[PDB]
C-alpha cells in the first residue's frame, strides 16, 4: 500500500461486505452489520472502466496488413522483412508487457487512496467525539444509534449536538 | 459503540503481475490479450477469398488440366495457396515476374 | 471477420493477439506473450 491503507493500518479486508469495494462496519446497541459506501465505489468503477477503455480505444489506429512473398533469389529483401517484423514484435511486446505492469501498480494504489480518503472523511467530521483506535476503527465517547450513524455515512454529522456528552466523558477516565 | 472502515474481498483466485510485486491475488480483472481463433478461414468484409486447393496461381491462370478452372468468382480479398501446391505447371518451365503478378492478382474487384 | 490468420480468424476487439505473426486485415498487434491481464479490483486477503 502506497497510502498505507490496505497492507498497512487496515490489516485484511471485510469478506462479509459484498455491496461495494469500500465500506463500514457498525456495532452499536441495536446490532452489528456491514454497510457499503456506494458513492465512492461508483467513482472508482467509473475510473477503472475508463482506464481499461482508454488502453484499448486509443490504439484504434490499425490498418491492412500481410504475410510473406519473396523467392529464394531475393533472400536479402526477405531478411529485411524479417528485421522489421521481428522489430515491431519486440517493441509491442515490451510496451504492452510493461504497460500492464505499470497500470496495475497504480490501479491497486488508487484503491488504497480511496480507502484512506474515506477513513479521513469520517475522521474529520468527528474530531474529539471519538477515539482513533489504529485498526482503522472509531470508538464513540457518546451513544450513537442506527438513526445517528446514517449521518456519518451521509456526511451530515453534527459536532455541536454530541459535544458536551463526549467532552465530559473524557475527564472521567482521565484520573 | 463503534464505526470501523474497510474494503471488499471475495473468493477470487485471479493473479495479476505488477511492476513491484509478482503473482498478486486480486478481486477482479480484465484480459487484454486475444488468445482464441475459430480455426476456419473466412470472408474479409463480405468478400470471398480465392481458395486454391490442389492448384497454384500459375496453373489457375493457365488451364492446368489436373486442377479445375471452374472458379467463376468475380471478386476476392486474398488468395490461399497451400505450402507446396501439387499442380504448378504440368509442362515444366518458368513464369516471368510471377511474384509481382501474384501480388497484382491478390485482390481484385471485377 | 475483420481479420484473418493461417491458423484461424480473430475477433479483434482487444488490442493484442498471440495467434500467428502473418495476418491479413485490421488485426490487433502481434505480441509474443501468453498473458496480459489487467487489474480492476484490489488486493484479496484471506
Amino acid at each position, epitope marked *: 500500500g502506497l497510502f498505507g491503507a490496505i497492507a498497512g493500518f487496515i490489516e485484511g479486508g471485510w469478506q462479509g461486505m459484498v455491496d461495494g469495494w469500500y465500506g463500514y462496519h457498525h456495532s452499536n446497541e441495536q446490532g452489528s452489520g456491514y454497510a457499503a459506501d*456506494k458513492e465512492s465505489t461508483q467513482k472508482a468503477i467509473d475510473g477503472v472502466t475508463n482506464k481499461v477503455n482508454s488502453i484499448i480505444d486509443k490504439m484504434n489506429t490499425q490498418f491492412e496488413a500481410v504475410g510473406r512473398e519473396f523467392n529464394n533469389l531475393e533472400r536479402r529483401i526477405e531478411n529485411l522483412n524479417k528485421k522489421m517484423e521481428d522489430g515491431f514484435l519486440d517493441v509491442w511486446t515490451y510496451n504492452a508487457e510493461l504497460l500492464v505492469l505499470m497500470e496495475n501498480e497504480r490501479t491497486l494504489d488508487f484503491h488504497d487512496s480511496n480507502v484512506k480518503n474515506l477513513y479521513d472523511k469520517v475522521r474529520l467530521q468527528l474530531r474529539d467525539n471519538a477515539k482513533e483506535l489504529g485498526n482503522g476503527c472509531f470508538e464513540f465517547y457518546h451513544k450513537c444509534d442506527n438513526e445517528c450513524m446514517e449521518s456519518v455515512r451521509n456526511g451530515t454529522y453534527d459536532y455541536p449536538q454530541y459535544s458536551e456528552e463526549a467532552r465530559l466523558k473524557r475527564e472521567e477516565i482521565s484520573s | 459503540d463503534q464505526i470501523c472502515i474497510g474494503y471488499h474481498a471475495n473468493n477470487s483466485t485471479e493473479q495479476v503481475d505488477t511492476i513491484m510485486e509478482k503473482n498478486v491475488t486480486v478481486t477482479h480483472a480484465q484480459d487484454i490479450l486475444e488468445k482464441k481463433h475459430n480455426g476456419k478461414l473466412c470472408d474479409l468484409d463480405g468478400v470471398k477469398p480465392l481458395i486454391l486447393r490442389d492448384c497454384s496461381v500459375a496453373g489457375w491462370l493457365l488451364g492446368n488440366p489436373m486442377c479445375d478452372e471452374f472458379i467463376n468468382v468475380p471478386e476476392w480479398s486474398y488468395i490461399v495457396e497451400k505450402a507446396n501446391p501439387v499442380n504448378d505447371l504440368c509442362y515444366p518451365g518458368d513464369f516471368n515476374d510471377y511474384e509481382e503478378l501474384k501480388h497484382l492478382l491478390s485482390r481484385i474487384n471485377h | 471477420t475483420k481479420c484473418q490468420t493461417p491458423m484461424g480468424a480473430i475477433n479483434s476487439s482487444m488490442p493484442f493477439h498471440n495467434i500467428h505473426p502473418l495476418t491479413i486485415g485490421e488485426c490487433p498487434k502481434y505480441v509474443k506473450s501468453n498473458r496480459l491481464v489487467l487489474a480492476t479490483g484490489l488486493r484479496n486477503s484471506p
Partner: antibody
Amino acid sequence: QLVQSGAEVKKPGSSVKVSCRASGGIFRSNAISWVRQAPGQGLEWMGNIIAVFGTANYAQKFQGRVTITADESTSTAYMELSSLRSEDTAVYYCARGPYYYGNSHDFWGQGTMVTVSS
Amino acid sequence: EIVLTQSPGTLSLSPGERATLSCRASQSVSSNYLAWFQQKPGQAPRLLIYGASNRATGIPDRFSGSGSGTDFTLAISRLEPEDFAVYYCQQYGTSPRTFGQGTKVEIKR
C-alpha cells in the same frame, strides 16, 4: 446497444432462461434489471442484478421461483424462471441503467416472447 | 410494497393542448426517486424523466416533471402526433421497484 435471446415456447411447470447481452466492449459497469409485460396490461418490474459483484435483489412477489445470474467477461445477464403458469405468458425486457446500483433506467432491450400454454 | 396509482387511465386530448398525468404513492417516496417512461405500440420503452423532474438526454423541453413526497405530476405542453402513447411512472427508492398501471393518451375527434 442491448440484445436479448429469441422466442421460446414452454409447457407449464417447465423452466425458462433468457439472456440479455449488454455491450460494452469490456466487463460490465451497469446493473441490469428485468421488466416483464403480459400483453395489454402494463409493466411489472421483476429483479435487478448489480454489476461488479453479482449480488441480485428480487421482488417479494416472485422471490422463491426466479433467479438472475451475471456473466462478467462477456457482460451478459441471464434470467431463469421456475414453475411457469399460464399468466407468466408475456414479453420480457432487460434494462441496464446508468450505473451499478441499480436505480434509474436509460437503455432498454428488445424483448422476448414467452408463451406458456402447451 | 409501495403501490403506485396513475390517473387518469385514458386522456382524450387534441394536438396542441396540455396533458397532465398524475402518480400518487401509497407511501413518502424516498428522496424523489421517481421516473416516467413512454411506450408506443410494437416498440420497447423510452426513458423520459428521472429523479422526479430531470429530463433525460435527447428529449424536448415540453416534457417536464414535478412534485415530491407522495404526489407526482408529468406535464406535456404542446402535444404532437408522436406523443400519443402509454405513460408509466415507476418509483425506484426502495425494492421492490413498482410501476403505475398505464395512463394512456389518445387523440380527440
